Amino acid sequence: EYGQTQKMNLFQSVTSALDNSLAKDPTAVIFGEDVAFGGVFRCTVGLRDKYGKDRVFNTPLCEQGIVGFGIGIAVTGATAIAEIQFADYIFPAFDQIVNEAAKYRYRSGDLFNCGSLTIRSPWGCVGHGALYHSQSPEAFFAHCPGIKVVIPRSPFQAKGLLLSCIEDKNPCIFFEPKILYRAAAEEVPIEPYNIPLSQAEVIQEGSDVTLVAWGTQVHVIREVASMAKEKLGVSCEVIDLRTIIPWDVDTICKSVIKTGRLLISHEAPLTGGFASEISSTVQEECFLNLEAPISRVCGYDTPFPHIFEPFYIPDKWKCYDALRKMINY
Amino acid sequence: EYGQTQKMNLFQSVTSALDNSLAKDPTAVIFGEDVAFGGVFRCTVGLRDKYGKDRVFNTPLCEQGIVGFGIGIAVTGATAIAEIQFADYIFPAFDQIVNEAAKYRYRSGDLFNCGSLTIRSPWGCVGHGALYHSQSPEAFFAHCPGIKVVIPRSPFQAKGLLLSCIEDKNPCIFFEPKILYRAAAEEVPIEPYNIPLSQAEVIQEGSDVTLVAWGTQVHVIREVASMAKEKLGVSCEVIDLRTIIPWDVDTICKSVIKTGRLLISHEAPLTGGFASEISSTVQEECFLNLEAPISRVCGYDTPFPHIFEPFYIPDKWKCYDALRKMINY
Amino acid sequence: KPQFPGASAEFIDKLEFIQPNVISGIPIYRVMDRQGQIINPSEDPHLPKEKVLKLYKSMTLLNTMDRILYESQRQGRISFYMTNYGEEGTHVGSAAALDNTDLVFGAAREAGVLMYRDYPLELFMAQCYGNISDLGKGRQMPVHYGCKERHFVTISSPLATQIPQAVGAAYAAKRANANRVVICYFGEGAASEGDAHAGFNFAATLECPIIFFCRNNGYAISTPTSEQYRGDGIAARGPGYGIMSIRVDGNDVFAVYNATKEARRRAVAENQPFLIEAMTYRIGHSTDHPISRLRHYLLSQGWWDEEQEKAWRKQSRRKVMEAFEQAERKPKPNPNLLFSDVYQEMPAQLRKQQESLARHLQTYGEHYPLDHFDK
Amino acid sequence: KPQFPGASAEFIDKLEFIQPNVISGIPIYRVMDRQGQIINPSEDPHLPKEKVLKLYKSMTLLNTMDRILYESQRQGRISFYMTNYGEEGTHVGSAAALDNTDLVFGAAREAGVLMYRDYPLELFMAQCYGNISDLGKGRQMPVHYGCKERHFVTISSPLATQIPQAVGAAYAAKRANANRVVICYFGEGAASEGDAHAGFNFAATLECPIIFFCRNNGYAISTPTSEQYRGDGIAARGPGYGIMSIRVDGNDVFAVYNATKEARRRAVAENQPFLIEAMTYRIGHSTDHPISRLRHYLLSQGWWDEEQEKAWRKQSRRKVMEAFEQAERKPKPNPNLLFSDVYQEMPAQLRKQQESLARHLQTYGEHYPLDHFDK
Numbered sequence A, B: 001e002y003g004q005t006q007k008m009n010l011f012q013s014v015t016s017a018l019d020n021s022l023a024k025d026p027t028a029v030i031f032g033e034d035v036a037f038g039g040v041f042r043c044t045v046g047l048r049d050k051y052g053k054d055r056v057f058n059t060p061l062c063e064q065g066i067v068g069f070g071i072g073i074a075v076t077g078a079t080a081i082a083e084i085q086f087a088d089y090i091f092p093a094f095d096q097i098v099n100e101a102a103k104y105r106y107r108s109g110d111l112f113n114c115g116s117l118t119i120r121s122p123w124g125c126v127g128h129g130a131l132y133h134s135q136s137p138e139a140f141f142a143h144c145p146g147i148k149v150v151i152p153r154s155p156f157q158a159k160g161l162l163l164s165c166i167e168d169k170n171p172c173i174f175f176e177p178k179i180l181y182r183a184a185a186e187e188v189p190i191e192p193y194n195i196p197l198s199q200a201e202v203i204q205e206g207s208d209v210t211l212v213a214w215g216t217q218v219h220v221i222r223e224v225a226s227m228a229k230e231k232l233g234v235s236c237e238v239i240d241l242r243t244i245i246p247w248d249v250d251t252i253c254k255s256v257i258k259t260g261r262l263l264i265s266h267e268a269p270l271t272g273g274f275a276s277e278i279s280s281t282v283q284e285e286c287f288l289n290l291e292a293p294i295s296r297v298c299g300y301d302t303p304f305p306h307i308f309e310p311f312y313i314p315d316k317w318k319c320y321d322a323l324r325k326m327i328n329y
Numbered sequence C, D: 001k002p003q004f005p006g007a008s009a010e011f012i013d014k015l016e017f018i019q020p021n022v023i024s025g026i027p028i029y030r031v032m033d034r035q036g037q038i039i040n041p042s043e044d045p046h047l048p049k050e051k052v053l054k055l056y057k058s059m060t061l062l063n064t065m066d067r068i069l070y071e072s073q074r075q076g077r078i079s080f081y082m083t084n085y086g087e088e089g090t091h092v093g094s095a096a097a098l099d100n101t102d103l104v105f106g107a108a109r110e111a112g113v114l115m116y117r118d119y120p121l122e123l124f125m126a127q128c129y130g131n132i133s134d135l136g137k138g139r140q141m142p143v144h145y146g147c148k149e150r151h152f153v154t155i156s157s158p159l160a161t162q163i164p165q166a167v168g169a170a171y172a173a174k175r176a177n178a179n180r181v182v183i184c185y186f187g188e189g190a191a192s193e194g195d196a197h198a199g200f201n202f203a204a205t206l207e208c209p210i211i212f213f214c215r216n217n218g219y220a221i222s223t224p225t226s227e228q229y230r231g232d233g234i235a236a237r238g239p240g241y242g243i244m245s246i247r248v249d250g251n252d253v254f255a256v257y258n259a260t261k262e263a264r265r266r267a268v269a270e271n272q273p274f275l276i277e278a279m280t281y282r283i284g285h286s287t288d289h290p291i292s293r294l295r296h297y298l299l300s301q302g303w304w305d306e307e308q309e310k311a312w313r314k315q316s317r318r319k320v321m322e323a324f325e326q327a328e329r330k331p332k333p334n335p336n337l338l339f340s341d342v343y344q345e346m347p348a349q350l351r352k353q354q355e356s357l358a359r360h361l362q363t364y365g366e367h368y369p370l371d372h373f374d375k
């Protein structure tokens, strides 16, 4: 349906998106720490040789500068694709993202904007990353009107969502689940294609319970749905949220009106996590349909540990047990 | 009950807390932009003359430095009371707060900490502050395990809560509602006293609905309770949350088990706002008691406007109308 | 003979710390003395009469506007104001040296740049009043100006955030083969922020056509520079980043113009940043003067006199008062406008919030100050 | 004659931009040449034999530990490692010049400082393995060390965040009349972060007894310094902040010691910051050498020879392997420890999460790698 494909893992799909963007948009540039030689996760391999040192280039080691600089390129109308080397290190740029990028169009009455900025950054747990190689900061950004935050679950989804972010006329943060960069490949179209922002995807229909997640945690809830079917005879509807803000309220509520039960899962800590927004909204819109309390199965409210990672993450057993109790409520 | 009092407005109550702290803790210092001459909101008037230039002093204009410096003082065990001049400007320090201060004790196994740090900052709307003099950033910090976030509603509450933050063995952010700094005074004990963190206060008992807010918005919901009684014959239980994290789950749930209905209000934007955490938690704990969906009456999901402020804020009419619909659900 | 990649240097065989030169710092470039006399004929730009009169009229018209809007703030007719007193020379002297289409990023204290670029009085006022004529739609605090036509990026309150942005716009201009330079203004207090270190380093390593223009007025609110830094002001920082740097007398419109003119020429030719630190003194912070020095100069060339000064003082007061009357009588924008431009397209959920406000005002509108809002 | 509060300077009547001196930068201080020969007798510290042997044994023991743990990482026995190759001289030369109780903040590449302070091999290992002996409770990535006994603040991954912290601990030390200095290590890449500009300025304006120790190894991961900055390295930045600054040969343990010793003496006496930039080359980033230069020196004084070198190489391998065997056989800490120390006291809601894990493991524990976790 999208022309010739090749097997691509998620890092390769990001390179493919970036290459397609450079090719078709002469204004576009890519920059950040260590992007010139191909990046610490290989996402920019080959691009500087192909497109030129003026278009794919290293910056000094300064995240607040990286984002501020990217905002400035986008103010002139040129496409700016900034990289932050790990999402854990995006916080130096929080003021440029929240006080500047997100508010740029509103506060000028649309005289100026930085819509052509995309910030991309590796995200989520990786087995042994501990406090500063594992973080999933999306809930910090979700409380900032003016930015879009997008997280793919696979190589196909990543390339289509990244192209949409690059082309969207709003500053976008694209979080790439790093534990998937070299995981299983899948077929990905070689030429450009887009997947819409603010649209969830129902990847398995079901009638007893709605399960919502994003990034790697989508694969966990897909496996939970299988455990539920086999062990409990329970039919789960499995939904990938994809865009954290602005999020697809209608797809989630339509599913919960049908099933009457919702479990949301994410690696980020429970308190203030984005499951909190989904649950309270679904509760408001689907109150009379709710058969059981909405469940949130999330990381604990601690920093992300090194040796204890296997005990910290909201894995398939934690999600399954939560689901079991909810079915029995 | 607390010895001699004087009428104090909220800025005066903050000066009183700070003076009491300096007096009884020889390690304590206060620092930030323009604190030496007494501060842009008069919160540090007189303190440098009284305690010395080494103890109350100006820093360079650099919020990331202010917080990093305060962390360093606290690592040695000395009490560090840093000021950020408006909460809107705390974001340059977000990485020092979230990646450093909050994680300092955990990541060292308690070999080091910065428990003796308090960051205090003016907060909330002020009539005409627009995008960068009005913000209420508490939901950004609520998703960070390791810090405490505390917001008082009055001069008495402010002094007692600020003393508790300064004395608490964890890094604390104390947000001072700036629209109350010169508003009505009330009697405040001259000598030190403490109000506990992580404890909500029920300020009016009621049986039909629970109303929860913090800062200035407490006074709004107190007035809503009066409108409800007079216009609807509805009895409202009015709760000041006081500590955003770790929050008093038990006081809120005990009230909702009794009334069966909850409305939460805050000036911060709806999406990702802290009402989202309270609502989803109360829903989990009080599901079977809920007579109507939990209501959130919050700022809109926009930056905070100059000329449109009267239309943006979750005022008593917006809260009352929401309450009316909830009673009728 | 040292082979280290990080620096190009010789060895030394004795321990010697490098001491800062702060007591005798970078000297202050000056063209005319306090009596408006040219000090060194080879440095006189010999600007033509019409241009020097535009510098003078721009500074004084700004000063006329400032007095009236400052009074308007004291009476509560506008919610905030802050004057340009003492800064008028840095504003107008630097703007005159730029191309009309050079992009400006500022800090908050450069209304004179817009004034020199012929920004209408009606539009300064519209922003301070947040009325329907404001292209900012009344969303920002007063004295936050922006103009896309005049290449003046909307000012924002957070200090120094414009500095790395300005560098990115300059990098983009370089690629576009714009033959354009970016100027970025900031105070000496803002230079303490981390974003200043970011912008200064990026402009050097990415080879950007940008002028950094620091106004050093000795104070950041209540903080004197003795508490702000301990090196030789901001100019001495430039060379550490590889940036060509100069300090000028900010009360001298000709010294400012000459340094800005030469920085612009070289920045655009060489794709390299320049730093100008203009020394002034903050005469007014918010709610030996450049104008008198230039007046003395004019009065020498025979190009101004008391009659002209009187007539212009009258004419400028009349123009300012006409704009002021119009600004006060305009309605504010429709409250609907609090929801647009958060994203380019309003999200359905944000539209729902807009609709909820419209319903609310239907029922409860008597309680809102809807009198002078549009629609 | 200029009267501006922001700077102390004369006027100049001609326009002259100040140019950076980058091609002939700050020279590199060196005490011994590549053959271990002292170049200038007046600069020789004449450290006694036992101390110079401790410098040598500390560097080489670190190198022995590095080879073994690097192999351990390649085999997946530990999850990450990064070596100290080429940095051993900066580590040990600077640590030897400090008081035992001077507080150290670091960046990640200064295990030699802990080694010089007699940090047990068992404890370096315990942190890399996250075993029950780790006082960090296995919570951080390997090669994140800390020791409260030895005044070495726990290292954190985010670059440069320790720099303004170190300044605050130094301000606190000044008030306490500690007669103590803080040292703060960082690489040349980390010096590009905003927090470096914060720390350098605060230390000058608040008059703090702190040594800033920048290791300039020419690279930050893949980024050469040509992409990192364009001034004359990091040493040339110090004077712009008012900080006394020096550049040394980081492969020369004596040049490092002498500069650190004199910086410490003056920082503590004068309450003023000092900046030392040590030039090295990154021989290894993560998963003309200082040791051979010092070996040549020893072999001159007649204080080392091949027999001693052989025996020490043996003894150090045995000590490292004893520690390694013990570290691998220790269990990991109880999983309960993932919840403590988030706050000093665990919040009731966090306790509830702990209890929920304990219940979970009761039912589902066969699915967890509980084999080598304590309890």
Ligand SMILES: Cc1ncc(C[n+]2csc(CCOP(=O)(O)OP(=O)(O)O)c2C)c(N)n1
Residues within 6 Å of the ligand: B033, B061, B063, B085, B089, C109, C157, C158, C159, C186, C187, C188, C189, C190, C191, C215, C217, C219, C220, C221, C282, C285
């Ligand atoms: C990030 C941030 N912190 C604090 C402020 C509050 N503030 C507004 S002006 C000012 C002093 C600015 O000094 P300087 O940069 O020298 O400019 P000047 O007002 O002297 O022109 C401060 C601290 C701000 N706007 N932004």
Ligand SMILES: Cc1ncc(C[n+]2csc(CCOP(=O)(O)OP(=O)(O)O)c2C)c(N)n1
Residues within 6 Å of the ligand: A033, A061, A063, A085, A089, D109, D157, D158, D159, D186, D187, D188, D189, D190, D191, D215, D217, D219, D220, D221, D282, D285
């Ligand atoms: C804030 C932040 N950004 C990015 C990184 C990833 N990172 C780890 S080391 C490094 C290079 C550091 O260079 P330098 O400071 O020169 O130290 P060196 O490794 O050369 O000793 C980078 C970019 C980080 N740890 N922190």
Ligand SMILES: [Cl-]
Residues within 6 Å of the ligand: C108, C157
């Ligand atoms: Cl301002």
Ligand SMILES: [Cl-]
Residues within 6 Å of the ligand: D108, D157
């Ligand atoms: Cl690291």
Ligand SMILES: [K+]
Residues within 6 Å of the ligand: A115, A116, A117, A118, A165, A166, A167, A168, A169, A170, A171, A172
């Ligand atoms: K975009």
Ligand SMILES: [K+]
Residues within 6 Å of the ligand: B115, B116, B117, B118, B165, B166, B167, B168, B169, B170, B171, B172
């Ligand atoms: K505290």
Ligand SMILES: [K+]
Residues within 6 Å of the ligand: C106, C107, C155, C156, C157, C158, C159, C160, C161, C162
């Ligand atoms: K700004």
Ligand SMILES: [K+]
Residues within 6 Å of the ligand: D106, D107, D155, D156, D157, D158, D159, D160, D161, D162
């Ligand atoms: K660090």
Ligand SMILES: [Mn+2]
Residues within 6 Å of the ligand: C187, C188, C189, C215, C216, C217, C218, C219, C220, C221
């Ligand atoms: Mn200033």
Ligand SMILES: [Mn+2]
Residues within 6 Å of the ligand: D187, D188, D189, D215, D216, D217, D218, D219, D220, D221
């Ligand atoms: Mn390096």
